[PDB]
Design a protein around this nucleic acid. Sequence first.
RNA 1: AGAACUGGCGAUGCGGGAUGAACCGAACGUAGAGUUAAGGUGCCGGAAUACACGCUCAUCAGACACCACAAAAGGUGUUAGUUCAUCUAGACAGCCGGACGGUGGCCAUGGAAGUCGGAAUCCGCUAAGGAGUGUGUAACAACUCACCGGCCGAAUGAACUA
RNA 2: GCAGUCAAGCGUUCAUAGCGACAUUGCUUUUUGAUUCUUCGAUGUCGGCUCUUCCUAUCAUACCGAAGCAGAAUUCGGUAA
Lengths: 137, 52, 143, 172, 191
Amino acid sequence: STDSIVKASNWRLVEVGRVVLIKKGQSAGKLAAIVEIIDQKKVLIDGPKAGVPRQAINLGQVVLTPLTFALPRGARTATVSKKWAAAAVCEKWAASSWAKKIAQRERRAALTDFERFQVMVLRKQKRYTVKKALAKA
Amino acid sequence: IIEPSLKALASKYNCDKSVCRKCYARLPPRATNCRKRKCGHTNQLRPKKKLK
Amino acid sequence: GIREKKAEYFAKLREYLEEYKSLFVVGVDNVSSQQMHEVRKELRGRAVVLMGKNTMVRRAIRGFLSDLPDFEKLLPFVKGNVGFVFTNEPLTEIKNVIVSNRVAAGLTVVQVYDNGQVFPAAAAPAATSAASGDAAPAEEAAA
Amino acid sequence: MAHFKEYQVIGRRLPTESVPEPKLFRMRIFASNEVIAKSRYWYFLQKLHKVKKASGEIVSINQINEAHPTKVKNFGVWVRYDSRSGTHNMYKEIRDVSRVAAVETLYQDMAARHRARFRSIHILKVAEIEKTADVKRQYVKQFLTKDLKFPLPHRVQKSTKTFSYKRPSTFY
Amino acid sequence: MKYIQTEQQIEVPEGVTVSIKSRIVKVVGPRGTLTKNLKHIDVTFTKVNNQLIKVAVHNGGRKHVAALRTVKSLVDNMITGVTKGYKYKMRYVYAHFPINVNIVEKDGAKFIEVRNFLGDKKIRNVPVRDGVTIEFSTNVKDEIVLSGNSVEDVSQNAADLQQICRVRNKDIRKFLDGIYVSHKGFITEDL
RNA sequence: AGAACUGGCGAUGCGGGAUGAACCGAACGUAGAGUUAAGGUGCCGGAAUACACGCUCAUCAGACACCACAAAAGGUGUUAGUUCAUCUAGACAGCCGGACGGUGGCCAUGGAAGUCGGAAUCCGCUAAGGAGUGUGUAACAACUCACCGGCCGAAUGAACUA
RNA sequence: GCAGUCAAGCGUUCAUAGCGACAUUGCUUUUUGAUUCUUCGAUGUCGGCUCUUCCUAUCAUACCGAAGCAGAAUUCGGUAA
Ligand SMILES: [Zn+2]
């Protein structure tokens, strides 16, 4: 090296346009966006698309996601909805592992007894062709 | 012996101090409070006494 | 007291902006307390020089943007360490008493004001050559 | 003293044949329920005017719902409170989305910082500071800056189960 | 009151390199390299360019914010030591018994030896620290001079010498003897 | 030690206060099922290592009524607050420029020009510059400072309350 | 019995180096009072001798800070049983 190498933590910022995942409550599970910062432990959020009511909420019951998108600070519900659509948030969200795994673990949870059986017979069938591969190179 | 300027050097260290009048702690000459936990960080200081 | 004195500065400032119709905005960056004391004597004829704090002058000038309002486009020039020289004498005479005289190793003119106008003091430094040839290259343009 | 509601409380002296139509007096009252709101009303009327509920009545009780409940506003709050050794006036500011919310953290804050319980506190005035830079306390101007953003370092997810087969990370 | 954000700036001058990982700092310059472990403070470094690095403390209160500034100076002092470098000058002070001062060593230790302090038949030894070099002024009587890249290590070695000569059981206003710091600065850009 | 009204203990188990005549809760046939009181819910120990906003770091922290004590007096620890004053006519702080003329002011003397020292503190020109804050000279010089301005851009000083 | 706060005063000069009046806050339970709760079908009643152990409000001994510490001597204080 001959540069000054300084690796700074790349934190999710609480900021207007930060999209967040609601951990707790009656809108738990859903995404919303940060509209306005109230104080160091509180924010105003809005999730028109995902069906979550514009409210003040503790940053405790929400997890910041890596998603941000252009949003004027204070935007009423209506325009939030327009900017969220414009930015294709849900699109980007669904493309993440974070989204996929939640969906996977919900699919697993939905399985019938019978379906688990099949998963067993299929997973078993797969193992066979794998250990063969495993014993070649 | 000892030139006036070296006699000043030794005085910056030995002679130019204040003293806590509660616990005798030897403090910087312009200190407002004492640094010691034991006398309750008092602001009752006094200058270290000069020689003849 | 502190308000009293500042208000006085607003007074004598206005006093020059009405009487004197022409203004020299100079810049005395560095410059001794002695030099300025001598520019006074060397201008005791007509011009008077008036120094002040920039924050005062803009506020004062803006405060007088009612009557005598064309001192608005004077404000972009009252930055840095500038001063004022008001006068009722011919242009190019005073300017060269200021600049060249009492120079050291003086003070520089940064802009000039004349009846609502803003001279760079460069256009003032005319040689009557660019004004004669323009009256010469146009007569031949008509012949 | 709970989850607060604001009340319009209005009463009057009982009519006398000498004074039918005595004047109506109103208060804005933060309390948990109407039964406290009414009682706080008389508490003050006793002290301000010279009246006892035994001779006056309660004309109307109405809840003042916050006008713009999802719009963040800066609140100026004025308070009179008693201490272990004196009684004092105070100005404070609170940033929130409703008066009712503002009052709640005021009542909490008085208790944490000054050990002042509900009984020991009069609320004098609560007023949404209209023009920013009429805000006068640093801990709120701090949040008034433009394009304002901050991280939340050292994040501690709560574990659902007692044992964990991986060392946790605080990485947010 | 807890401060939403507060920061400091470190000018990285022409010729030095500063690299930071896990709050461990390495500063490399024409005089050499210095390392420092700042794990004991929660600060997050961020680089703007090879000339400037910003230190910050998000959401911190008074005593936390106070450490921020001292991190700057800490790192600052490293940078200058590795370019300008540091030098502490001292002076021998005695009224009768001339303090005789030499360098001796065992197993390649290097000590500062001090004899005849106030007539003392005893012999004091200050271990010389790794990275500080002891010279003796040639144009100034009874001086002695300690130079290195680290103020920390140089100033401390200077104090160790000065502290070994502390005069016991006498009025120390009258018995002014000792070795005291006479000047402190650099080894570059004048003296 | 001695009275007043009431409630207790004595004569009374039970739940709580670790413990305990008198406190809190509640008074008692033999049992089942539910719900509670006072008090509790990290583990001992039945019951949220619950939710929420702050405060606190104690090389003698603190932790619950009766109750198993603490004071006059102090702190530039940290938190919130009050008051007077300064400041968008630009302060505070930081960096930078200027810091002048009568005049080496009068005495005093080897020599003393702002700065060993006596008495005076005046004027000019000022945006400002003391008949002088220091450093330095034999005495001048040179440098510094009060004072003013350049840049910056919203807070700053002092005394207090708990 | 022991320790504080205030500072008039002492200390050639100087309140606080060392002290400290008038007043005033406390601590202790080796004094002595006060009380009468336990023991009057009995807890051997003083001092010394002997031996162990504890308290620290420290006399000595270790290392310090302070002085009206020049040295020698002393005094004030800290960590210290
Ligand atoms: Zn002390």
